[PDB]
Design a protein around this ligand. Structure first.
Ligand SMILES: [K+]
Ligand SMILES: [K+]
Ligand SMILES: [K+]
Ligand SMILES: [K+]
Ligand SMILES: [K+]
Ligand SMILES: [Mg+2]
Ligand SMILES: [Mg+2]
Ligand SMILES: [Mg+2]
Ligand SMILES: [Mg+2]
Ligand SMILES: [Mg+2]
Ligand SMILES: [Mg+2]
Ligand SMILES: [Mg+2]
Ligand SMILES: [Mg+2]
Ligand SMILES: [Mg+2]
Ligand SMILES: [Mg+2]
Ligand SMILES: [Mg+2]
Ligand SMILES: [Mg+2]
Ligand SMILES: [Mg+2]
Ligand SMILES: [Mg+2]
Ligand SMILES: [Mg+2]
Ligand SMILES: [Mg+2]
Ligand SMILES: [Mg+2]
Ligand SMILES: [Mg+2]
Ligand SMILES: [Mg+2]
Ligand SMILES: [Mg+2]
Ligand SMILES: [Mg+2]
Ligand SMILES: [Mg+2]
Ligand SMILES: [Mg+2]
Ligand code: NA
Ligand code: NA
Ligand code: NA
Ligand code: NA
Ligand code: NA
Ligand code: NA
Ligand code: NA
Ligand code: NA
Lengths: 137, 64, 378
RNA sequence: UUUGAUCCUUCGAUGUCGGCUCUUCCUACCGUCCGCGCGCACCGGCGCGGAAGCGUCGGAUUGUUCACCCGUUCAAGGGAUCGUGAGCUGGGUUUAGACCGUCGUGAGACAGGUUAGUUUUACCCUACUGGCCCCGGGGCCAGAGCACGGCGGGCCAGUACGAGAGGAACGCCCGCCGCGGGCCGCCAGCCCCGCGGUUGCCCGGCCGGGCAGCGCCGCGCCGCCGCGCCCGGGGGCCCUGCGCUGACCGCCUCUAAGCGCGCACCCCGCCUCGCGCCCCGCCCGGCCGCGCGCCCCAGCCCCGUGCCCCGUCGCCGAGCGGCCCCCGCCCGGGGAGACCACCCGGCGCGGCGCUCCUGUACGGCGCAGAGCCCUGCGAUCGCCUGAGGGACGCGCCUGCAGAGCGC
RNA sequence: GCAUGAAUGGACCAACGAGGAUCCCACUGUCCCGAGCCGCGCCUCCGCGAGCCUCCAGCCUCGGGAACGGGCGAGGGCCGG
RNA sequence: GUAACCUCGGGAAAAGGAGUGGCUCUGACGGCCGGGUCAGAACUGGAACGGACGCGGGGAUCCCGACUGUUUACUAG
C-alpha cells in the first residue's frame, strides 16, 4: 500500500501550464510530451492547471515518437524547468530546459537511464529517480 | 558568512541569498552575482574584454 | 436566472468603508487582558519603521523538512527611542462601560509634550498647565489624587510620550500614548508601580522579550483614487469592449431598483488603519553597541546601520527591535507594538547566525566600508 | 424552475436569444458537520432527521439552453422583467443583394438549407463609491459591518476486525489548495530625461551637438509591482436528539414538573467605521428641581392601603441631582493628494563627503598597428585610467537665507 | 436520393480570388493574470460660453389597485448645501 | 537549393539555407586622361553590420466562379 510520492513538499513556483510541450529525459522511446492534466489539482473558474518540478502530470506522446505509445494518456514526472524558483534556504535556481520522465503511479520507471541533471525536489519525492539519476542539482 | 561563492562571469564575491545559479545540460553549475552578469553570459560576450571583470584585469596585468 | 458557474465574491466586506483614516495615527483599540497575580508589567510601546534586511538562522522544528538546517528569512527593523512617563489615568467599570475617574499629571512636563498641545509653538501664547504647575509644586496634591485613584479605580494606565529629537524625523512635537499596567495583586500595587516611574524614561528592553510574539498597528501606504481592477481585484473585460475594459460589466439586477453596498466601485485606495498579528521578536539591542549585529561566524564589528544608510530614513541612534516578517506602512510611519492576544502555538526558537548589512541603495556587495576600501585599492 | 389554455395591462414602441462580466437570494442537501437505522465484522455502500457556512472545476464539437465525451480534489437543483444591450459582443433569429431543392402558368412561397449585411444620447433627479462646509490633547461607547474552510502525509498500524483477501478510528505533529489583509530584504517586470553603442541628414573637419512627434539598441538608481515574502489556533445558548431522576396509570416509561450532554448552523469577542459622550488643560462661571426600605404570592405574617393642592401659597441655606458656556487661518513641504482635506514645519537653494549606476573620459605618449604611391596616411590597440560623467538615498554647512497679512 | 442529373447544362479541372471552410509549422498580452510607463483629453484657474429635456416632485418594504406606485393604507428611515 | 500537379505557358520569391560594417590593399573592363561597376585578400570592432527608414509569414486540403473587368453614391464587392 505505497502509491504516491514520499513526504510533503514545500510550495514551489510552477512554470508549466496545461498545453506545454516538454522534452523526454529517459530512453523510453519518446521525443516530446504534451501536458494535458495535473494530478491532485482543484481548479478555480478560468484558471489553467499548472505544475512544477517533482509533481505528477498526464501526457500524450507526440507525432515524432515510437508508435507503441502514441495514443494513450500516461503519467510522468517533471524533473527540469526553465522558470526560476526559490528554495527554503534562499537559493534561486533554474535549468536550461523543461524535461520529464515517464513513470508509473506506484513509481517504477519505464526506461533504463535518465539523461542530464535532475532537480533535488523530484529526487527526494521519488526514490526510483534518485538512483537512476546521474547528477542531482 | 564565511561560506560565500564566486561569480562565474566576473569573479566577484557573493553573499548569502543574493543571486541565481544555473545548471547546464553538461552538469555544470554556474553562479551569477546579478542580472547584468547573467545577461552578459547569455549573450556570449567574452569576459576577457569587459574591463571591470577579473578575467579582463588579469589579462592586462592589473590583477596578479 | 441562476449564475451558471460557481465562484466567490471578490474582497472582504469586513473592512468597509474603504476611506482615509481619520485617526491621527495607529491607535490601540484593545489591550491584553489583565490576569491577577502575574508579575506587574507594561503592555505596549510606540516606535518608527526603519527598514528591512536578511537573516540566516538555524531551524530546530521536529517533524519538518527544515528540522536540522539553515533558512534565509526576511526581517523588519523598528526604531524605539525611550519613552517618558508623565501622567496616570484610572478607569472604573460601570454599567455604561469604562469611565475615567481622574488623570494626574506630573509636576514638570517636557518641551515635546507642550509642543503637542499647540499648532504653532513660536506664535502661540504659552498657557497650558500654567496654573496647574504652581499647585502641584509640592507632593500633597499628587498624593491626594493618587489616593482617589486607589479608592475608586479598576484599570490603571500611564501616559508616555516619544522624543523625536533622537530620530531623523523633521517633526518636533511628540506622540502621546496610553499604556496599560497588567498584573499585580490589587489596584494599590498597580498605582504604586505606576507612580514609581513618573517623569522617568522607559526602555523597550523592559517591555518585550526575544522570542515572544507581538501585534503591530499602523496605517498602510496611500495610493489616492483608484479603479475597480486594482481596488477590488475584479476580472478585466475582453479587448473588443467599447469604452474601455477596466470595470465591472453589470452593477446589479433590475430589482431591487437600487445599487447594493456589496458591489465594487472606484474610490480611495490605501492609507487605512490596519493591524498585523503574531510577529516574532528576533533581537532587542542598541545602535550604541559596536558588536550590535556580530555573530559567531563573523569577524569585523558590524552595527545595525547599513552601508550607505537606511534608504529614505535617517540613521538609527539608539535602541531598536527586530521582528520576523513585515508590518503595514512605509518608512518613518509611527508603529504601535503590543503583546499578542492569540499567539501562535508552535514557533521554533530564534537562533541567528548572520545578518546582512550591505548597501540597500543599489546592489551592494560589501558588508562594511573598510572591506570596500581594501577592495578598491583606496 | 416545462408546455398548454385564456386575452386583464402595454401598438403617439417597456430595445426582442445566447455568451462574457458581477451581486444577491431560495432549499425540495450532491461533498463536508452532528445524530439514528441497515440484509452495518473491517473497507465500502444504502436509508432517515437537523443543517444553506464553504465547495460544486479545466477542455474537444455545436450560436446554442440542452446534450455528449476526455480529464482532475470525481463535481445538487433553482430565482431575481425567461437578473444583467445609454455594460459589451453580434454567432443565431428577423429588412433591403445572391444561390440550391420542392411548390406555383406567373409575379412569388417555404417553423427547408446557405453566404454578405450602420448596435445612437447622461452634463439632470435618485441610488451607490469616495470627498468637503475649520475649531485643544487623551479616551469611551450606542448603532452598522464582519472571514478560515477544504484536501493530504507521519506516528497510532500492517494493529483492532476478519477463514483469507484485505483493513480502520480518537489524539498530536507537519504540509498543500482556495480565499483574505499587508509588504519589497531576496528574485522577476517596468524606466523622466543617467551612462554606453549605432544609421541618415545638418552645424567646414576633430571634439561636442541638434533633427528623425522618445530614431533604435544594452544596462540601470529612488519608486510601483507578482511570477516573490509575511500573517489567519477564542467563547455562549441550545435545535434535531441521546440520557438521569420520575408520575398521571399499584407495573413500565428520556417528560408531565425537575436535571445533564450536545452541530461547518445561530449570537458574542477579536477586527473596520462610528453620531454622541467622558477626563484633563486655559477658566473656575450661570441656571433649574426637592421625593429612596427590601423580598415573596400554595403563608399571603394578618393585609382587602396610601397619595389624591405644582400653587390651589409652596419658593432661605445645606445636601443631592441635572443642564448651559470654553478652544484660528492664510503660507511652505510630504510619508498625504482630482479640488479639498490629512500629517508636519526657521522652509529651502547651492555645495562638500559617503554610497552606487554606467563601464575606462578628452588629450598626450607608444620599437603597438594590417598595409601603402612611405621622411607621410591609417581603422583599431596599450598606458596615465575600476577612469570620467551622473544621482530624486544618507551625513555635514565653509555661502545665501528662512518665524509675515485677515480673524 | 423527403425533394440529384445532363446548354432550366452534367462531370472534371491547371492559373487566378480584399470569396466560404478545416488542419499543420512559425509567432505572439488572445489568454493563465495582469504590471509599469509616454503624450493628449479629463481635473484646478483666467477669458468665452450653448443643446436636449421638463404635470408636479424626486428614500424604502408589504398590501390593495387597469393584476410590477414617488404620492393611496400600514410600517421603517432621513438636518440643509 | 527548389516538390506534387499542369491547358507544358506555369507552379516559383515554392519550400529552405548562408553572407552583408569599418579600414588597408589587389585585379578586370576604354581613349589617343575619363569612368564607374564587378570580383578577391589581410586587419579590426560586446559573436556587430538591409544597425533609423523603407520592406512577402509559410504549407496541406475542400466548395464556388475559368481568367483581367463591373456593381447597391450614404449598412450588402
Ligand atoms: K452561483
Ligand atoms: K407596445
Ligand atoms: K442581449
Ligand atoms: K529601477
Ligand atoms: K473576390
Ligand atoms: Mg471561463
Ligand atoms: Mg465595437
Ligand atoms: Mg534598494
Ligand atoms: Mg427602458
Ligand atoms: Mg424608451
Ligand atoms: Mg428541511
Ligand atoms: Mg440596461
Ligand atoms: Mg449575423
Ligand atoms: Mg436577405
Ligand atoms: Mg457620503
Ligand atoms: Mg455589532
Ligand atoms: Mg529588480
Ligand atoms: Mg530643421
Ligand atoms: Mg506619497
Ligand atoms: Mg428532380
Ligand atoms: Mg436535353
Ligand atoms: Mg437543377
Ligand atoms: Mg412615478
Ligand atoms: Mg401615505
Ligand atoms: Mg471572378
Ligand atoms: Mg478582380
Ligand atoms: Mg453601400
Ligand atoms: Mg461595403
Ligand atoms: Na417564470
Ligand atoms: Na432577459
Ligand atoms: Na445598446
Ligand atoms: Na466635466
Ligand atoms: Na549623431
Ligand atoms: Na477571526
Ligand atoms: Na581615448
Ligand atoms: Na418598490
Amino acid at each position: 500500500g505505497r502509491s504516491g510520492g514520499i513526504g510533503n513538499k514545500f510550495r514551489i513556483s510552477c512554470g508549466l501550464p496545461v498545453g506545454a510541450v516538454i522534452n523526454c529525459a529517459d530512453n523510453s522511446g519518446a521525443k516530446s510530451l504534451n501536458m494535458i492534466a495535473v494530478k491532485n489539482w482543484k481548479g478555480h473558474l478560468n484558471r489553467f492547471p499548472k505544475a512544477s518540478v517533482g509533481d505528477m502530470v498526464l501526457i500524450t506522446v507526440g507525432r515524432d515518437g515510437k508508435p507503441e505509445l502514441r495514443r494513450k494518456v500516461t503519467p510522468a514526472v517533471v524533473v527540469r524547468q526553465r522558470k526560476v524558483w526559490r528554495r527554503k534556504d534562499g537559493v534561486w535556481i533554474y535549468f536550461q530546459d523543461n524535461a520529464g520522465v515517464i513513470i508509473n503511479p506506484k513509481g517504477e520507471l519505464k526506461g533504463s537511464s535518465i539523461t542530464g541533471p535532475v532537480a533535488k525536489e523530484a529526487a527526494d519525492r521519488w526514490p526510483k529517480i534518485s538512483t537512476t539519476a546521474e547528477c542531482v542539482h | 558568512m564565511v561560506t560565500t561563492n564566486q561569480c562565474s562571469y566576473s569573479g566577484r564575491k557573493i553573499l548569502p541569498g543574493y543571486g541565481k545559479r544555473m545548471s547546464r545540460h553538461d552538469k555544470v553549475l554556474l553562479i551569477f552575482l546579478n542580472r547584468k552578469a547573467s545577461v552578459h553570459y547569455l549573450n556570449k560576450w567574452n569576459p576577457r574584454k569587459i574591463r571591470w571583470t577579473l578575467a579582463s584585469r588579469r589579462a592586462r596585468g592589473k590583477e596578479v | 436566472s441562476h449564475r451558471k458557474f460557481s465562484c466567490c465574491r471578490k474582497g472582504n466586506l469586513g473592512y468597509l468603508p474603504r476611506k482615509r483614516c481619520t485617526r491621527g495615527r495607529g491607535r490601540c483599540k484593545t489591550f491584553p487582558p489583565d490576569v491577577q497575580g502575574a508579575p506587574i508589567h507594561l503592555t505596549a510601546f510606540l516606535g518608527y519603521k526603519a527598514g528591512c534586511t536578511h537573516v540566516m538562522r538555524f531551524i530546530d522544528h521536529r517533524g519538518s523538512n527544515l528540522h536540522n538546517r539553515q533558512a534565509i528569512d526576511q526581517a523588519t527593523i523598528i526604531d524605539a527611542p525611550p519613552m517618558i512617563c508623565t501622567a496616570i489615568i484610572g478607569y472604573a467599570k460601570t454599567p455604561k462601560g469604562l469611565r475615567a475617574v481622574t488623570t494626574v499629571w506630573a509636576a514638570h512636563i517636557a518641551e515635546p509634550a507642550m509642543r503637542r498641545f499647540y499648532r504653532n509653538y513660536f506664535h502661540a501664547e504659552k498657557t497650558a498647565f500654567s496654573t496647574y504647575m504652581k499647585k502641584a509644586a509640592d507632593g500633597t496634591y499628587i498624593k491626594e489624587q493618587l489616593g482617589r485613584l486607589k479608592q475608586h479605580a479598576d484599570v490603571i494606565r500611564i501616559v508616555a510620550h516619544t522624543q523625536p529629537a533622537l530620530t531623523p524625523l523633521k517633526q518636533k512635537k511628540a506622540d502621546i500614548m496610553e499604556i496599560q499596567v497588567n498584573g499585580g495583586a490589587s489596584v494599590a500595587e498597580k498605582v504604586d508601580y505606576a507612580y514609581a516611574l513618573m517623569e522617568k524614561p522607559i526602555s523597550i528592553k523592559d517591555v518585550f522579550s526575544v522570542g515572544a510574539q507581538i501585534d503591530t498597528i499602523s496605517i498602510t501606504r496611500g495610493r489616492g483614487f483608484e479603479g475597480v481592477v486594482t481596488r477590488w481585484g475584479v476580472t478585466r473585460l475582453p479587448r473588443k469592449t467599447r469604452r474601455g475594459n477596466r470595470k465591472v460589466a453589470c452593477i446589479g439586477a433590475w430589482h431591487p431598483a437600487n445599487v447594493q453596498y456589496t458591489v465594487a466601485r472606484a474610490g480611495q485606495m490605501g492609507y487605512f488603519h490596519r493591524t498585523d498579528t503574531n510577529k516574532q521578536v528576533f533581537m532587542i539591542d542598541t545602535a550604541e553597541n559596536p558588536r550590535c549585529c556580530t555573530t559567531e561566524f563573523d569577524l569585523t564589528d558590524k552595527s545595525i546601520n547599513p552601508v550607505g544608510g537606511f534608504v529614505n530614513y535617517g540613521r538609527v541612534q539608539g535602541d531598536f527591535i527586530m521582528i520576523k516578517g513585515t508590518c503595514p506602512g512605509p518608512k518613518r510611519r509611527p508603529v504601535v507594538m503590543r503583546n499578542a492576544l492569540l499567539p501562535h502555538r508552535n514557533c521554533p526558537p530564534v537562533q541567528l547566525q548572520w545578518i546582512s548589512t550591505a548597501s540597500k541603495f543599489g546592489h551592494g556587495i560589501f558588508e562594511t566600508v573598510e572591506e570596500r576600501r581594501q577592495f578598491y585599492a583606496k
